[PDB]
């Protein structure tokens, strides 16, 4: 292939893409995605990174809104962000740790923007719905057994009455 693309980079393998749909989750009464919303999103991501590095690795790292670098902003509200070192921009946090941090504190990020796990897609971090807890076995079997027992008792009573009448 002759030529080159202005969109690829060796560190683009550590980027996480975020896609946001404001007017689908909220319909009306939906805020516009200006720079202030981007600042709030970067602060939420930095908070999630801080929480992950404090509650797992026992390392106090002072992330900030300048350590979550964002590129490729589009009117869809779909960009690529990557989290770097606090003051060592040349150092990029590996994508696995970023994904673990996002998974750990995704509910807070969703609550900060009033989105729920479907209008805020991280394209690589798929949420888990939750196991459908089951009764001991089910209710169809118990009700079926009760009904068939009642039917058998009634049939036996009717047969006994008929035999007595015929006797």
């Amino acid at each position: 292939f002759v030529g080159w693309s202005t969109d690829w980079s060796p560190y683009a393998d550590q980027s996480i893409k975020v896609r946001i749909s404001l007017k689908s989750a909220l319909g009306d009464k939906a805020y516009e995605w200006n720079d202030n919303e981007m600042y709030l999103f970067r602060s939420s991501v930095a908070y999630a990174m801080r929480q992950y590095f404090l509650k797992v690795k026992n390392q106090m790292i002072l992330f900030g809104e300048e350590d979550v670098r964002v590129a490729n902003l589009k009117p869809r509200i779909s960009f690529n962000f990557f989290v770097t070192a606090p003051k060592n921009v040349s150092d990029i946090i590996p994508r696995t740790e970023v994904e673990k941090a996002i998974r750990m504190s995704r509910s807070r990020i969703n609550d900060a923007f009033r989105l729920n796990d479907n209008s805020l897609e991280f394209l690589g971090i798929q949420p888990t719905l939750g196991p459908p807890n089951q009764p001991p076995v089910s209710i169809w079997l118990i009700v079926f057994g009760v009904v068939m027992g009642v039917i058998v008792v009634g049939i036996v009573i009717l047969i006994f009455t008929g035999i007595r009448d015929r006797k």
Partner: protein, 572 residues
């Protein structure tokens, strides 16, 4: 008083016109099937029903006795009137079992047809439950466990077999217990279906996109109006719903007073049955149109989401009202990207969905489960509807079994060898053993076969034989004179003409058209579930299934001619 009206309504309202009619109507394009049914009612329903009622009233005998008194070499037709009914008892009670199943899964807050099962990662949904609706997946997999093709059939599924056994036990209990208390039972078991249908009609009309189904059901498409299969199905369905051919009407008429009015009774019964079937179709097709509209909206939303994701548009920029314009703009902007996903875009329209939203023998169950899942208190409405449907099925099965057992009850030799009460148990056991076939993995295909052919040709042939015997063998003038002597006000010329040269001619013409269509097409195919596509695909019938259907039809059709030949041999 109102007791007679309630009894007539109960005799007219049955599981047939509630369940089978919507499925046939959806299969044959809605209005293109509805129009013949009204045509087939005023031509075949009222005249033949009144003829059967008059014969039963005048002869003062059972079906076999009446058709033996009319002519010796014709008496065997009465035997046929049992055999077909037996075939009904082979499979009809199976429907009740399904109702039982759908009742037993009605006491749970997480209704089985409400939430799709998880794939296993607890992250998404099953592919079968995603491509198809939750109700459809529950019906075709968690209830019937149907196989993709009829050729492969598994073992007898134990839960459906247990449900069928419970249904047969309930039928036998009702046979033993209920013999004359129905007069009180008519006070309650005749109006509940109408109330349930009113409630479900209200719920359907309160749903978004409900008028589309009503418009579809009342649209008389001329393209599919010419199909003889629609006429044949309408004729057999009206005959089955009115009970013609089964001989129960003759037995009931033999128990009435000779001065009892028959024309009014027949007209009222036919009109009530037709109105009830139309009302049930209205409610079912309102819910069906709701389902089709929901599927259409979901498809449009998926297409818009894919376009927005792959072209980075605004969230609300792309809507249903301006889809094709945006598609054209994207094509004119960069056709390479548009063509990179052009095969992925799906063309979905209201007509295609309404044609193939939900279809099959369980249209009523799927449609009403979908309606229930969008209620406020789903469990209560589910229990009420399934109890009503089960009660209707129980009543219909009780009538059919009484009609079957009456010739056996009148058998002096049989009564002298075994107790009368044990005969009912033996019949129930034999019917359950025969109907356990439908509980297999592919038992739904056999149920469809025995719902499409076990009463299609047999009832038509029985009705044709009966009307020919009444019009020409016994003598129309003699029958009219006897009826005038019995009650006065001899039959009007309308009824005489219909009995003489309208109904038999129409039956013969419809049979000839159906035979010609089958011979020309030669491609009798059945719908089969496809989980990979999550839809229904037409597949050619296998040789053994076609032979079984042919044998089932042939036994009922040849029951009468064989006995006629035997009687002729005995005379000679």
């Amino acid at each position: 008083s109102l007791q007679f009206v309630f009894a007539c309504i109960s005799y007219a309202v049955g599981l047939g016109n509630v369940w089978r009619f919507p499925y046939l109507c959806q299969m044959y394009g809605g209005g293109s099937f509805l129009v013949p049914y009204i045509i087939m009612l005023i031509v075949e329903g009222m005249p033949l029903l009144y003829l059967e009622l008059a014969v039963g009233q005048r002869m003062r005998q059972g079906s076999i006795g009446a058709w033996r008194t009319i002519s010796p070499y014709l008496s065997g037709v009465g035997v046929a009137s049992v055999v077909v009914s037996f075939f009904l008892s082979m499979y009809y009670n199976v429907i009740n079992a399904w109702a039982f199943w759908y009742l037993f899964h009605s006491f749970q807050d997480p209704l089985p047809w409400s939430v799709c099962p998880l794939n296993g990662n607890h992250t998404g949904y099953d592919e079968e439950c995603e491509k198809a609706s939750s109700t459809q997946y529950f019906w075709y997999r968690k209830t019937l466990n149907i196989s993709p093709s009829l050729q492969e059939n598994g073992g007898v599924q134990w839960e459906p077999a247990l449900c069928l056994l419970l249904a047969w036990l309930v039928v036998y209990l009702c046979i033993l217990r209920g013999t004359e208390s129905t007069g009180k039972v008519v006070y309650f078991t005749a109006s509940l279906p109408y109330c349930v249908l009113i409630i479900y009609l209200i719920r359907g009309l309160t749903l978004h996109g409900a008028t589309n189904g009503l418009m579809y059901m009342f649209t008389p498409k001329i393209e599919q109006l010419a199909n003889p299969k629609a006429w044949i199905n309408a004729a057999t369905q009206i005959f089955f719903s009115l009970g013609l051919g089964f001989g129960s009407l003759i037995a009931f008429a033999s128990y009435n007073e000779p001065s009892n009015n028959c024309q009014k009774h027949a007209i009222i019964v036919s009109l009530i049955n037709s109105f009830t079937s139309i009302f049930a179709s209205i409610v079912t097709f309102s819910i069906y149109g709701f389902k089709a509209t929901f599927n259409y909206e979901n498809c449009l939303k998926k297409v818009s989401l894919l376009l927005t994701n792959t072209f980075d548009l605004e969230d609300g920029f792309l809507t249903a009202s301006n889809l094709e314009q945006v598609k054209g703009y994207l094509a004119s902007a960069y056709p390479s990207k548009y063509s990179e996903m052009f095969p992925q875009i799906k063309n979905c329209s209201l007509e295609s969905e309404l044609d193939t939203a939900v279809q099959g023998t369980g249209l009523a169950f799927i449609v009403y489960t979908e309606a229930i899942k969008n209620m406020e208190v789903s469990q209560l409405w589910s229990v009420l509807y399934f109890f009503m449907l089960l009660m209707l099925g129980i009543g219909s099965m009780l009538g059919n079994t009484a009609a079957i057992l009456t010739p056996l009850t009148d058998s002096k030799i049989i009564s002298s060898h075994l107790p009368k009460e044990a005969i009912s148990g033996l019949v129930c056991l034999v019917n359950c053993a025969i109907g356990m076939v439908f509980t297999m993995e592919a038992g739904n295909y056999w149920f469809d076969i025995f719902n499409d052919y076990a009463a299609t040709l047999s009832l038509l042939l029985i009705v044709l034989v009966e009307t020919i015997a009444v019009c020409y063998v016994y003598g129309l003038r003699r029958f009219e004179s006897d009826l005038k002597a019995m009650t006065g006000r001899a039959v009007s010329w309308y009824w005489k003409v219909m009995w003489a040269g309208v109904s038999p001619l129409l039956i013969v013409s419809l049979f000839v058209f159906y035979l010609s269509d089958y011979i020309l097409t030669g491609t009798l195919k059945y719908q089969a579930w496809d989980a990979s596509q999550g839809q229904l695909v037409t597949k050619d019938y296998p040789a053994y299934a076609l032979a079984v259907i042919g044998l089932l039809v042939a036994s009922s059709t040849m029951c009468i001619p064989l006995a006629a030949l035997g009687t002729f041999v005995q005379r000679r």
